[PDB]
Design a protein around this nucleic acid. Structure first.
Length: 58
RNA sequence: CGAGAGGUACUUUUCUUUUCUUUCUUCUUCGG
Protein backbone atom coordinates (compact mmCIF):
# COMPACT_ATOMS: atom_id res chain seq x y z
CA UNK A 1 0.00 0.00 0.00
CA UNK A 2 1.28 3.48 -0.88
CA UNK A 3 1.69 6.31 1.61
CA UNK A 4 -0.86 8.49 -0.23
CA UNK A 5 -3.84 6.31 0.78
CA UNK A 6 -4.20 6.58 4.58
CA UNK A 7 -3.41 10.31 4.93
CA UNK A 8 -6.74 12.07 4.33
CA UNK A 9 -5.97 15.31 2.49
CA UNK A 10 -9.56 16.62 2.52
CA UNK A 11 -10.06 16.50 6.31
CA UNK A 12 -7.98 19.67 6.74
CA UNK A 13 -9.57 21.56 3.82
CA UNK A 14 -13.15 20.70 4.84
CA UNK A 15 -12.35 21.80 8.40
CA UNK A 16 -10.72 25.08 7.37
CA UNK A 17 -13.55 25.93 4.95
CA UNK A 18 -16.13 25.20 7.67
CA UNK A 19 -14.23 27.31 10.22
CA UNK A 20 -13.97 30.17 7.73
CA UNK A 21 -17.64 29.94 6.74
CA UNK A 22 -19.34 29.38 10.11
CA UNK A 23 -16.89 31.56 12.04
CA UNK A 24 -16.53 29.00 14.85
CA UNK A 25 -12.81 29.07 15.68
CA UNK A 26 -11.06 26.73 18.10
CA UNK A 27 -10.88 27.68 21.77
CA UNK A 28 -7.33 28.41 23.03
CA UNK A 29 -7.84 26.64 26.39
CA UNK A 30 -10.43 24.02 25.40
CA UNK A 31 -11.39 21.54 22.69
CA UNK A 32 -15.17 21.97 22.35
CA UNK A 33 -17.23 25.21 22.78
CA UNK A 34 -15.94 27.00 19.70
CA UNK A 35 -15.93 30.79 20.05
CA UNK A 36 -17.64 33.09 17.55
CA UNK A 37 -16.39 36.50 16.48
CA UNK A 38 -12.96 35.77 15.01
CA UNK A 39 -13.63 36.15 11.28
CA UNK A 40 -15.99 38.68 9.71
CA UNK A 41 -17.22 39.91 6.35
CA UNK A 42 -15.88 43.02 4.65
CA UNK A 43 -18.00 46.06 3.86
CA UNK A 44 -17.83 47.35 0.29
CA UNK A 45 -19.79 50.60 0.55
CA UNK A 46 -16.67 52.81 0.77
CA UNK A 47 -12.90 52.18 1.11
CA UNK A 48 -12.92 53.53 4.69
CA UNK A 49 -15.09 50.66 5.99
CA UNK A 50 -12.77 47.98 4.60
CA UNK A 51 -9.81 49.97 5.96
CA UNK A 52 -11.23 50.05 9.50
CA UNK A 53 -12.32 46.41 9.17
CA UNK A 54 -8.65 45.43 8.73
CA UNK A 55 -7.83 47.58 11.79
CA UNK A 56 -9.88 45.97 14.56
CA UNK A 57 -8.93 44.26 17.83
CA UNK A 58 -11.51 42.30 19.83
C1' C B 1 -38.13 26.97 7.83
C1' G B 2 -34.50 27.47 12.09
C1' A B 3 -29.34 29.47 13.90
C1' G B 4 -24.71 33.14 13.40
C1' A B 5 -23.38 38.22 12.32
C1' G B 6 -23.71 43.52 11.47
C1' G B 7 -27.45 47.88 11.33
C1' U B 8 -31.78 51.84 12.39
C1' A B 9 -33.43 52.97 17.13
C1' C B 10 -33.26 56.93 24.72
C1' U B 11 -31.84 63.56 22.26
C1' U B 12 -29.90 67.77 27.23
C1' U B 13 -34.32 65.15 29.52
C1' U B 14 -33.53 68.77 34.97
C1' C B 15 -28.55 73.76 36.46
C1' U B 16 -31.06 77.44 39.26
C1' U B 17 -33.04 84.13 40.69
C1' U B 18 -27.61 86.09 36.97
C1' U B 19 -28.87 91.04 42.10
C1' C B 20 -26.38 86.49 48.78
C1' U B 21 -21.66 89.50 53.36
C1' U B 22 -16.44 93.74 54.33
C1' U B 23 -18.20 101.76 54.47
C1' C B 24 -13.92 99.92 58.52
C1' U B 25 -11.49 101.31 65.23
C1' U B 26 -15.76 102.41 68.72
C1' C B 27 -20.06 104.73 74.52
C1' U B 28 -23.25 98.08 78.67
C1' U B 29 -27.37 99.39 81.78
C1' C B 30 -28.74 100.72 87.25
C1' G B 31 -27.98 102.50 93.04
C1' G B 32 -24.45 104.49 96.80
Amino acid sequence: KPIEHYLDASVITNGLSRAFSTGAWSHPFRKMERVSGVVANLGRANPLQTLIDLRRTR
